[PDB]
Amino acid sequence: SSVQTAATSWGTVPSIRVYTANNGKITERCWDGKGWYTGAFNEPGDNVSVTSWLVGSAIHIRVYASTGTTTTEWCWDGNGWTKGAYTATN
Amino acid sequence: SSVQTAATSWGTVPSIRVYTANNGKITERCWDGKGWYTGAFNEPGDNVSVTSWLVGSAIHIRVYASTGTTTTEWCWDGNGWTKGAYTATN
Amino acid sequence: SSVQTAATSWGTVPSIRVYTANNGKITERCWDGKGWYTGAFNEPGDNVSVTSWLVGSAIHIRVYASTGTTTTEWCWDGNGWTKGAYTATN
Numbered sequence: 073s074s075v076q077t078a079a080t081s082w083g084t085v086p087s088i089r090v091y092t093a094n095n096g097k098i099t100e101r102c103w104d105g106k107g108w109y110t111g112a113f114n115e116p117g118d119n120v121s122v123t124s125w126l127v128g129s130a131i132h133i134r135v136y137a138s139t140g141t142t143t144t145e146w147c148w149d150g151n152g153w154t155k156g157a158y159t160a161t162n
Numbered sequence: 163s164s165v166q167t168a169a170t171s172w173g174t175v176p177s178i179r180v181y182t183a184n185n186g187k188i189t190e191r192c193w194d195g196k197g198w199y200t201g202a203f204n205e206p207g208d209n210v211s212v213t214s215w216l217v218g219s220a221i222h223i224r225v226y227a228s229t230g231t232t233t234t235e236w237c238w239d240g241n242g243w244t245k246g247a248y249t250a251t252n
Numbered sequence: 253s254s255v256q257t258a259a260t261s262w263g264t265v266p267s268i269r270v271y272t273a274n275n276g277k278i279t280e281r282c283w284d285g286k287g288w289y290t291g292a293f294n295e296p297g298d299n300v301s302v303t304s305w306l307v308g309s310a311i312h313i314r315v316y317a318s319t320g321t322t323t324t325e326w327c328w329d330g331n332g333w334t335k336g337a338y339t340a341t342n
């Protein structure tokens with residue numbers, strides 16, 4: 073009966089992203105060094121995980137949002153969220 | 163009815179931290195290359211996530227502990243755990 | 253009643269590993285830059301977390317699989333999964 077979170081970070085300041093699954097919806101809070109704010113990610117899901125990697129100074133984020141046995145991958149690559157190629161046969 | 167864990171690591175040896183939420187309490191186990199031991203983190207929460215980053219050789223850890231819809235951020239920056247500025251309106 | 257995932261990544265292409273706990277079993281999907289495929293990890297568990305680190309170009313993965321209050325660590329160090337030394341007194 074609690075929310076469920078996932079977190080990732082990059083750099084040294086750092087930048088942080090925290091995803092919260094709450095009543096079937098996943099939202100995103102962001103830190104870039106000067107206060108928390110609400111990010112552009114808002115998608116359905118009961119469970120969330122995240123990973124990210126830098127290429128130079130460019131961040132790439134992958135969020136795995138699951139409802140039932142269906143996991144949807146969401147991708148941030150500098151210019152908006154897009155649905156990723158991830159599949160699994162759960 | 164199972165415990166729930168979160169893990170982070172840094173360096174090459176490496177150092178590892180594993181957080182376990184169990185019956186509303188989050189505790190920490192630590193690896194620095196020569197055996198597992200119990201860490202200083204002990205806080206209430208039904209759900210845990212973690213991220214960390216290095217600045218040179220200095221580790222910074224953020225633990226997100228949630229009870230109900232309330233997420234509390236805990237910060238390690240070399241000299242003790244402190245409550246962080248994270249908020250969310252869940 | 254949803255599956256539960258954990259994710260890690262390394263490099264710049266990148267490589268990604270996504271672990272899914274589903275009905276007491278944890279399986280692994282892999283991305284190395286040219287399509288998702290099923291990995292060698294298949295172990296019992298209701299809950300999963302993961303962390304990984306590079307040593308040069310060599311990846312090291314630690315997966316924490318929990319059933320009830322018992323967490324088992326699984327280790328990938330380039331040549332097969334092995335059970336790790338992790339213990340906790342949950």
Ligand SMILES: OC[C@@]1(O)OC[C@@H](O)[C@@H](O)[C@@H]1O
Pocket residue numbers: 089100102110111112113148
């Ligand atoms: O600057 C904030 C932002 O653009 O950062 C990258 C992603 O986390 C986005 O969802 C988010 O809105």
Ligand SMILES: OC[C@@]1(O)OC[C@@H](O)[C@@H](O)[C@@H]1O
Pocket residue numbers: 134145147155156157158268283
């Ligand atoms: O679209 C970006 C993408 O190719 O990045 C690597 C993996 O995350 C893929 O599933 C994903 O589709």
Ligand SMILES: OC[C@@]1(O)OC[C@@H](O)[C@@H](O)[C@@H]1O
Pocket residue numbers: 179190192200201202203238
């Ligand atoms: O050396 C152990 C320790 O100081 O490492 C940093 C943090 O994980 C602390 O909670 C922990 O007690």
Ligand SMILES: OC[C@@]1(O)OC[C@@H](O)[C@@H](O)[C@@H]1O
Pocket residue numbers: 088103224235237245246247248
């Ligand atoms: O106190 C340390 C701090 O500033 O570090 C960056 C973010 O984790 C903040 O929420 C946090 O308060």
Ligand SMILES: OC[C@@]1(O)OC[C@@H](O)[C@@H](O)[C@@H]1O
Pocket residue numbers: 269280282290291292293328
């Ligand atoms: O190339 C795939 C593979 O060998 O990568 C490392 C680990 O993720 C293994 O479980 C997996 O089968």
Ligand SMILES: OC[C@@]1(O)OC[C@@H](O)[C@@H](O)[C@@H]1O
Pocket residue numbers: 178193314325327335336337338
């Ligand atoms: O076997 C590899 C190992 O030594 O790596 C570091 C830690 O993950 C240990 O628990 C583990 O046993």
